Amino acid sequence: QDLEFTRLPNGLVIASLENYAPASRIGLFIKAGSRYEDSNNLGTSHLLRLASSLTTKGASSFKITRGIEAVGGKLSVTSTRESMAYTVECLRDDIEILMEFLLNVTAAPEFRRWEVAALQSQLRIDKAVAFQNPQAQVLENLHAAAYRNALANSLYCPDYRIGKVTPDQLHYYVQNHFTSARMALIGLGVSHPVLKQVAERFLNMRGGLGLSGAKAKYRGGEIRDQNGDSLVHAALVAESAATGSAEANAFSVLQHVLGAGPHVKRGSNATSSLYQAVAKGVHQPFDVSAFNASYSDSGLFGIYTISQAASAGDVIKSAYDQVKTIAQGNLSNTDVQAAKNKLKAGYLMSVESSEGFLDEVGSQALVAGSYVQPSTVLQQIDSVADADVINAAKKFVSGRKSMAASGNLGHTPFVDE
Amino acid sequence: SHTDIRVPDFSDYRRAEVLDSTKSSKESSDAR
Amino acid sequence: MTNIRKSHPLMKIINNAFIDLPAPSNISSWWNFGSLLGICLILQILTGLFLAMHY
Amino acid sequence: MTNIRKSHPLMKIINNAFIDLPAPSNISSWWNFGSLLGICLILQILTGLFLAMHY
Amino acid sequence: ATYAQALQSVPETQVSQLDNGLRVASEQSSQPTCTVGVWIDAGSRYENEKNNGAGYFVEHLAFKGTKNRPGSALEKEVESMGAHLNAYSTREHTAYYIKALSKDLPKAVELLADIVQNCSLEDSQIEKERDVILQELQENDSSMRDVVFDYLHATAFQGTPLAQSVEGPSENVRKLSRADLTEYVSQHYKAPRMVLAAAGGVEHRQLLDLAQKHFSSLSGTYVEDAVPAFTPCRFTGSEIRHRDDALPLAHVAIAVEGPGWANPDNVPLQVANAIIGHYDSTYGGGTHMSSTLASVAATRKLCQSFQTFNICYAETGLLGAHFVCDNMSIDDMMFFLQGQWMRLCTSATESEVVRGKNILRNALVSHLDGTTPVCEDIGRSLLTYGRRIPLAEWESRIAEVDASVVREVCSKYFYDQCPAVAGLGPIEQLPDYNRIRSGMFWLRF
Amino acid sequence: WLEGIRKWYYNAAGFNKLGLMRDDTIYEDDDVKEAIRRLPENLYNDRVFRIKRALDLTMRQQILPKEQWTKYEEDKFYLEPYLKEVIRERKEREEWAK
Amino acid sequence: MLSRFLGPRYRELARNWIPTASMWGAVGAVGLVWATDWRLILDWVPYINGKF
Amino acid sequence: RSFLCRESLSGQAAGRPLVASVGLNVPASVR
Amino acid sequence: LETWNIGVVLLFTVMATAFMGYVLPWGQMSFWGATVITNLLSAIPYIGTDLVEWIWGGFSVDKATLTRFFAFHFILPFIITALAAVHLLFLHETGSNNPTGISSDMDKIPFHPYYTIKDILGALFMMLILLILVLFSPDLLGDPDNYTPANPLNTPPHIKPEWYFLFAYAILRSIPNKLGGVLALVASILILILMPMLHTSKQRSMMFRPLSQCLFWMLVADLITLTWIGGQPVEHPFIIIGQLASILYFLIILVLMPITSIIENNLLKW
Ligand code: HEM
Ligand code: HEM
Ligand code: HEM
């Protein structure tokens, strides 16, 4: 009836909450992502994410697929730049079965040569599907043009590695990035004893911490792209802060102060300062929003903009000017309070869904290692003062920039201007 | 637009049973 | 795994010749005689054999 | 311009049949009895006809 | 705690009814958030040709302004507490819901009352709103999935109001007026067809007392006497083909007349539908998925996005599939997909029926996760069924259906029934309607 | 004893004279296509040679000299580990079919 | 044609297609007696028998 | 999809880092 | 598979054609062999009797039988040609089988320059033997009694079918039961259809199967023994030799070859 953390001697923090829900979700979160990829194994993480049904040590691909389908389960491998989350959710009197299916695919894989070779083609399909939305390309180019190494690595395999990701790279990546110390097993709707039983039964296979990655450095590039789509997706960011600090909370509050996104369908973002500031000016279809991306060792605060090709030069300008206003103390406490309310609501509403709560617990366990109640998170959010937001804005303004743009970039202003 | 298009009226060709817009064709499907 | 109509090597030619053969939509009755010849030939083969039975 | 052997319908069929058909090199003499059968059949088709015209 | 015990817990959906007709219905479990919204029963079904598209326009102008909240001030409030106000308008139901913290429940219901009762409908916003819809119509024109389902409804329920699109033809939206919208609001936004709903930290007593002192002004009478009645629709098995070779893929949708909301045959048929399942080229299951059609498609790379559907209106529905494949796959897929249906109509096996039951159970349970889906379920169920079906009852119905029941219901709905195919794009291998109807029966049987 | 009989049979079999290893004489059924496709590149590349050379001897209807014959002790079972895996997968699929 | 075809699903499929196959055999039998004009059946029949 | 008005653009501007996800019986998604 | 089934059909129809053609010249042997062979069909229960007059066209092999046999013997070889075309059609989709059995897709050579001349040589070599047959000793393969006007009043002292049918006649006269004889006649040829199923050796080629090779040559000797026995009249010791040869032939095709293949595979780690 409550959350229960447990750090076994080999790390591997175990969390479980018996919510008595008709369905239970077991998710294993691993501190292994693109940032831990090196210059020679680029795309390995993407292949691993695409390899969630390959023949494991104790369960052939046919058995895994057929069993999970027969009990009616989903095996998601939700991945970030710094974490990969396996997840299976099914009815209460089934999880045991798929529990094994989750573990064999995460700690005892085989990576058979034929299966990997056949799966290599799926990398192109996934990249093409995921790159239809322009934001994917822009965000990947942003990380490439902002971080020198580590975080710069894309979540998707570069086209020059499609078909050349040998299974040996997969085995090395698993052995050096799936050790017990860097993983967290979370279970919603399952009792803690059985979770501990399966953990110490099999997940103890790979002890240790593993090959640590390298801290990402901030270059400040301007990776651009003239792809020809009418809308110009531009994004201008700067090194904000690492998550888990007062600076991170202040930047998160600043995001809602400027603008977080739509709240009323068929609205106008009247409260959002960025949208209204740009609205005076560009009288054309457009959208703007503050962008906060907090990572384990660094972070990025900036502005994302989608506007008409010709008008883009105004938007990226006008929106930026708005942030400049917040820099030299042009912010009222009422806006701070509204942003705090929006942020608290957004946090308490991400955890609404059971899967969202599972992701929250997984992130807390992987990064911090000690879950904290939403109430204390609200206290931390409230603890931010106006001067801290004003700073944060100063740090963003007087900091090395990083721009990424895609579209007809004829009138897109350059990072120097 | 997709909304603008519509099926032209076929009332000249329909069988007697399926001719009104309120009845259901399931009743007379077996007959036809 | 695949329709026998378009999988069997012998069925390939029959399907492509009489089942899924793209034919003009506005073909008049004057083209029906193309079949009428062939069918008629079979009768001439069918009858003509039986005449050869007792001859 | 296209080679008539591999473009004309009848020539295409004959070409795939017994012109450019990929056959094993170590085919022994015992496979010859395939073609010979047809040959005798052809001869059997032929001579019988010339018998059938005086029977 | 096994599955059954968790199903029993299932906090209840206490339902009440104030005098004017509006029925409140809440579901409180623990959560500090809430999703409070009304579910006015209206849509393209209750719309004649002259005013087809009024409902979409009304939903567009709902949040723009009110008599109480002048203009964008309503948006200012909604964003002040961080609420995410939203609205969706199907062919039968049109709903407004606010996703907000439970503490701000008193304000949210007041905001809902203002939007759904005291709407200005001001002329200038109508003119500005006109451009948005027209552009939205082009966006939906590019929505290569949506146009196919619109074609399905147009070519299946011809003549009937169901064929009418939700947005409306791009000629009524250019000739509408405050008069036409005001009649729509007066004739449809009435208390009997309104389901105030909430889920989360919402005490049912709270919702009731708030409804009495905010929504009691809603009337139940209908102008002079005019009451928009129910016009039953007819399923005219037909075919529509919009051949457009420029489009890369070829969306095709085929459906037969499936049951209505009240018909219990939904429970077996869904299981049968779950048998065929769904697939996308990025699934990862590949040639190992238990669904035969999915395994074939992944093995031969036939489709990209085939998926079954069970669109079900009040008295009739559409039951079938929608597949997206290249130009030279349709002729094959119409062979396999139909070839699957007949198999279910002739040789359904309890081995796969158990799998279908499990998939249906997981779909029902997972869909009811989070406050907003719960509120959607409450608002939709009080209208379609008249009561929120508890998950225990769903479990009982799923337990009843077996191989014989699935075979019987598929034979009663699928076998020998004229389809309602609808193509788009480079559809040329798409077999002629005679061929499609030919596949609807198996000569072995 | 058995091994003597298997010696005699291997000597009298014939594929030793042609340089063919034991797993080269498999009749290719539906599973053996997948077995061959599953082979690593080096084994595939040696197998295609061995087969082509053997077909060369047979078309000339000659044999290799005694020295270049595959001995019983030198007959690797390269295909068998993949063949048994393919068979096991097929049997698993058949069991699931019931 | 071995233990593969023997299983609970195959037995159930047999049961499912037994009525159809059996009355297909009935179709074949009726067609055969009709085509052959089999007296040894047709005599026992009603009105048909008056042909002879 | 076509996006050519002020409204439909709203929500397209991402404000959080990209997160990709694929499954076994669910399609690939990004955020 | 399909090529093999089509080949079995070709064998059936060509043997029927040859029987009818041999009936055509209307010698004593022709008429009497026709009577015996058609009368064999009486063994079938119930409707076996009625087929005999239907095929006969009357109450005995007479005018109608000869005329209709001429007609069928004329038409059928064109059916043989059609089935042979389908045979080749089916063969092409997989390609010919080399003596080694293993797939030779890495060694295929074009047909036109190499095998056209090889089959020219083969056909000419066959014509050599055929011309020795026709030109030097024409009636070497055929009963001299055929050169006698057929008379339905005097059975010839020696009764046999042609040299290519005596082998089946041996099994016919082996089984005392008439219906058993006809069933054995059908089965002697139809047993080729069971051969693809009975193959249990992991090798598809008989080059590397010594024991099976000895079995195959024993089968060939069995067929030649059946032919010779069919030539001889049914007396001691030909009767028991015929029974033993029939049993041995069926036993080899059905049992010895599969058991030999199984012990074969056991002998080679598979
Ligand atoms: C191309 C198709 C054919 C045509 C146009 C054709 C035409 C004719 C004609 C006009 C006659 C004269 C009939 C009479 O005067 O009474 C005839 C007779 C005959 N035909 Fe054919 N015939 C054909 C096919 C065949 C075939 C395939 C056979 C053999 C199987 C055959 C066997 C005979 C025989 C035996 C006679 C003589 C008996 C008689 O006069 O009817 N015919 N044919
Ligand atoms: C399939 C190939 C054929 C075979 C195996 C075959 C076989 C035979 C045989 C064994 C005889 C008996 C010869 C004799 O006793 O003197 C014969 C006679 C005859 N065949 Fe054929 N035949 C074939 C094709 C044909 C064809 C296509 C025709 C018709 C064009 C034909 C017409 C005749 C005639 C007229 C006779 C009687 C003349 C005679 O017996 O000398 N045959 N055939
Ligand atoms: C009407 C007489 C026949 C003709 C004209 C004929 C024609 C042919 C030809 C030309 C070939 C290719 C050459 C070869 O491989 O031998 C062939 C192959 C073949 N035929 Fe026949 N055939 C006849 C009878 C038969 C019979 C009676 C059978 C057995 C039931 C049969 C089964 C085969 C097989 C299995 C092959 C493939 C041989 C291989 O792959 O090595 N055929 N046929």
TrEMBL record, chain E:
Q: Name one GO molecular function term.
A: metal ion binding
Q: What are the Peptidase M16 N-terminal domain coordinates in residue numbering?
A: 23-169
Domain Peptidase M16 C-terminal, chain residue ranges per copy = 175-360
Topology in the lipid bilayer: Peripheral membrane protein
Species annotation: Sus scrofa (Pig)
Compartments it resides in: Mitochondrion inner membrane
Q: Which family does it belong to?
A: Belongs to the peptidase M16 family. UQCRC1/QCR1 subfamily.
Name of the protein this chain belongs to: Cytochrome b-c1 complex subunit 1, mitochondrial
One Gene Ontology cellular component term attached to this UniProt record is:
protein-containing complex
Query: Where is the chain membrane-spanning?
Result: none
Q: State where it is primarily located.
A: mitochondrion
Q: Where is the signal peptide?
A: none
Q: Which InterPro entries match?
A: Metalloenz_LuxS/M16, MPP/UQCRC_Complex, Pept_M16_N, Peptidase_M16_C
Q: Which UniProt keywords apply?
A: Acetylation, Electron transport, Membrane, Mitochondrion, Mitochondrion inner membrane, Phosphoprotein, Respiratory chain, Transit peptide, Transport
Q: Describe the protein's quaternary organization and the partners it interacts with.
A: Component of the ubiquinol-cytochrome c oxidoreductase (cytochrome b-c1 complex, complex III, CIII), a multisubunit enzyme composed of 11 subunits. The complex is composed of 3 respiratory subunits cytochrome b, cytochrome c1 and Rieske protein UQCRFS1, 2 core protein subunits UQCRC1/QCR1 and UQCRC2/QCR2, and 6 low-molecular weight protein subunits UQCRH/QCR6, UQCRB/QCR7, UQCRQ/QCR8, UQCR10/QCR9, UQCR11/QCR10 and subunit 9, the cleavage product of Rieske protein UQCRFS1.
UniProtKB/TrEMBL annotation, chain G:
State the Gene Ontology BP annotations: mitochondrial electron transport, ubiquinol to cytochrome c
- Predominant cellular place of this UniProt entry's protein: mitochondrion
Listed A to Z, the keywords are: Electron transport, Membrane, Mitochondrion, Mitochondrion inner membrane, Respiratory chain, Transmembrane, Transmembrane helix, Transport
Membrane-spanning segments: 21-41
Q: Name one GO cellular component term.
A: respiratory chain complex III
Q: Which domain of life is it from?
A: Eukaryota
Question: Which Pfam families does this UniProt record tie to the protein?
Answer: UCR_6-4kD
Question: Topology with regard to the membrane?
Answer: Single-pass membrane protein
**Where found, per UniProt?**
Mitochondrion inner membrane
Family, per the entry?
Answer: Belongs to the UQCR11/QCR10 family.
What is said about its interaction partners and assembly? Component of the ubiquinol-cytochrome c oxidoreductase (cytochrome b-c1 complex, complex III, CIII), a multisubunit enzyme composed of 11 subunits. The complex is composed of 3 respiratory subunits cytochrome b, cytochrome c1 and Rieske protein UQCRFS1, 2 core protein subunits UQCRC1/QCR1 and UQCRC2/QCR2, and 6 low-molecular weight protein subunits UQCRH/QCR6, UQCRB/QCR7, UQCRQ/QCR8, UQCR10/QCR9, UQCR11/QCR10 and subunit 9, the cleavage product of Rieske protein UQCRFS1.
Q: What is this protein called?
A: Cytochrome b-c1 complex subunit 10
**Which gene holds the coding sequence for this protein?**
UQCR11
Automatic annotation (TrEMBL), chain H:
Subcellular localization(s) per the UniProt record: Membrane; Mitochondrion inner membrane
Q: Which domain of life is it from?
A: Eukaryota
Miscellaneous note, as given in the UniProt record, is: The Rieske protein is a high potential 2Fe-2S protein.
Q: Family assignment? A: Belongs to the Rieske iron-sulfur protein family.
Name of protein? Cytochrome b-c1 complex subunit Rieske, mitochondrial
Q: Which organism is it from?
A: Sus scrofa
| Location of this fragment in the whole protein | 47 to 77 of 274
UniProtKB/TrEMBL annotation, chain I:
A GO MF term: metal ion binding
Binding-site positions, ubiquinone-10: H92
UniProt keyword Nucleotidyltransferase, yes or no? no
Q: What GO cellular component term, any one, is given?
A: mitochondrial inner membrane
Name the positions where heme b 2 binds. N97
Q: Which residues are noted in the entry as a ubiquinone-binding? A: H92
Residues binding heme b 1: H87, S96, N97
Q: Which domain of life is it from?
A: Eukaryota
Question: Which residues hold heme b 4?
Answer: H73
Gene Ontology BP annotations: mitochondrial electron transport, ubiquinol to cytochrome c
Entry's localization field:
Mitochondrion inner membrane
Indicate the segments forming the Cytochrome b/b6 C-terminal region profile domain, all copies.
101-270
List the transmembrane segments.
6-24, 31-49, 69-91, 112-136, 179-198, 210-231, 237-259
Q: Which residues bind heme b b566?
A: H87
Q: How is the cofactor bound?
A: Binds 2 heme groups non-covalently.
Swiss-Prot/TrEMBL cofactor(s):
heme b; heme
Q: How does it sit in the membrane?
A: Multi-pass membrane protein
Record's keyword terms, sorted: Electron transport, Heme, Iron, Membrane, Metal-binding, Mitochondrion, Mitochondrion inner membrane, Respiratory chain, Transmembrane, Transmembrane helix, Transport, Ubiquinone
Similarity comment text for this entry: Belongs to the cytochrome b family.
The free-text function statement in the UniProt record for this protein reads: Component of the ubiquinol-cytochrome c reductase complex (complex III or cytochrome b-c1 complex) that is part of the mitochondrial respiratory chain. The b-c1 complex mediates electron transfer from ubiquinol to cytochrome c. Contributes to the generation of a proton gradient across the mitochondrial membrane that is then used for ATP synthesis.
> Subunit notes for this chain?
The cytochrome bc1 complex contains 11 subunits: 3 respiratory subunits (MT-CYB, CYC1 and UQCRFS1), 2 core proteins (UQCRC1 and UQCRC2) and 6 low-molecular weight proteins (UQCRH/QCR6, UQCRB/QCR7, UQCRQ/QCR8, UQCR10/QCR9, UQCR11/QCR10 and a cleavage product of UQCRFS1). This cytochrome bc1 complex then forms a dimer.
Q: What is this protein called?
A: Cytochrome b
